[PDB]
Design a protein around this ligand. Structure first.
Ligand SMILES: NC(=O)CSc1nc2ncnc(N)c2[nH]1
Length: 265
């Protein structure tokens, strides 16, 4: 209902909804995110602001914004593939070559964000969308924030994200570096893809499955489905001390990361 028709509902969250809009003249599809500022104005001005900085093949395109009352309309690349979440078979995951390719595309997007001083802070399969040729795009910058400006880093203090995906320092420390948190969440997503389950409700000393992983009990049941070469990478991502945790440039040199698995189109 805005130059375009609102054909179907795409992702009814908390803020409002994402709809698939079609232009009735040109037949062009986009996603429109609809937020009723009455039902925050502060984070939404941050979201659109972050979104205008963004330009990359593995980040959901931003086309523009109108205010039409209280109602903000973020116009956004439509991804006809839907959520990575729906390509993960529960208890099974997906073929390893598919997982690896999605993991390459996720790191490409994350390297790009971090390079422009942005952290997403909520990486999980619900927030990773697939375009028409199954290319992965990072979606939803509503929790995103700047962690580097004029080349100076600032530590984060606000706890946010989604508990099974969150790194342990964010539960333990008053301030923490933004990039190791995104890396950790990337390793939970890789686990979800290769085992089709999440390893723990949250990375707490009070959580048994998490305790089991630190004791390297990899005979148990996320890890036993995985396979020694991706598992070795996960041993380097899911390291409790954020300073010993592997970084992205070092992820790109990992053996499974560079292992040939998958054919072309
Ligand atoms: N609820 C949210 O914050 C986003 S839901 C969503 N956003 C989308 N953008 C493009 N294509 C889709 N299928 C989309 N689904």
């Amino acid at each position: 209902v805005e130059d375009w028709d609102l054909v179907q509902t795409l992702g009814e969250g908390a803020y409002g909804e994402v709809q698939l809009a079609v232009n009735r003249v040109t037949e062009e599809a986009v996603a429109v995110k609809i937020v009723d500022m009455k039902r925050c104005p502060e984070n939404i001005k941050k979201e659109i602001c972050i979104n205008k900085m963004l330009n990359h093949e593995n980040v959901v395109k931003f086309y523009g914004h109108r205010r039409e009352g209280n109602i903000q309309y973020l116009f956004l690349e439509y991804c006809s593939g839907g959520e990575l979440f729906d390509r993960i078979e529960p208890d099974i995951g997906m073929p390893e070559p598919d997982a690896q390719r999605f993991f390459h595309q996720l790191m490409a997007g994350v390297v790009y964000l971090h390079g422009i001083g942005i952290t997403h802070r909520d990486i999980k399969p619900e927030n990773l969308l697939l375009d028409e040729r199954d290319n992965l795009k990072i979606s939803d910058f509503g929790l995103a924030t700047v962690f580097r400006y004029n080349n100076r880093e600032r530590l984060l203090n606000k706890m946010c994200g989604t508990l099974p995906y969150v790194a342990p320092e964010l539960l333990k420390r008053r301030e923490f570096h933004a990039e190791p948190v995104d890396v950790w969440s990337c390793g939970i997503v890789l686990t979800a893809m290769l085992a089709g389950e999440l390893p723990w409700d949250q990375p707490s000393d009070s959580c048994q499955e998490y305790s089991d992983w630190k004791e390297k009990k990899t005979y148990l049941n996320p890890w036993k489905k995985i396979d020694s070469a991706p598992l070795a990478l996960l041993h380097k991502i899911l390291v409790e001390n954020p300073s010993a945790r592997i970084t992205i440039p070092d992820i790109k040199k990992d053996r499974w990361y560079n292992k040939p698995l998958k054919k072309g189109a």
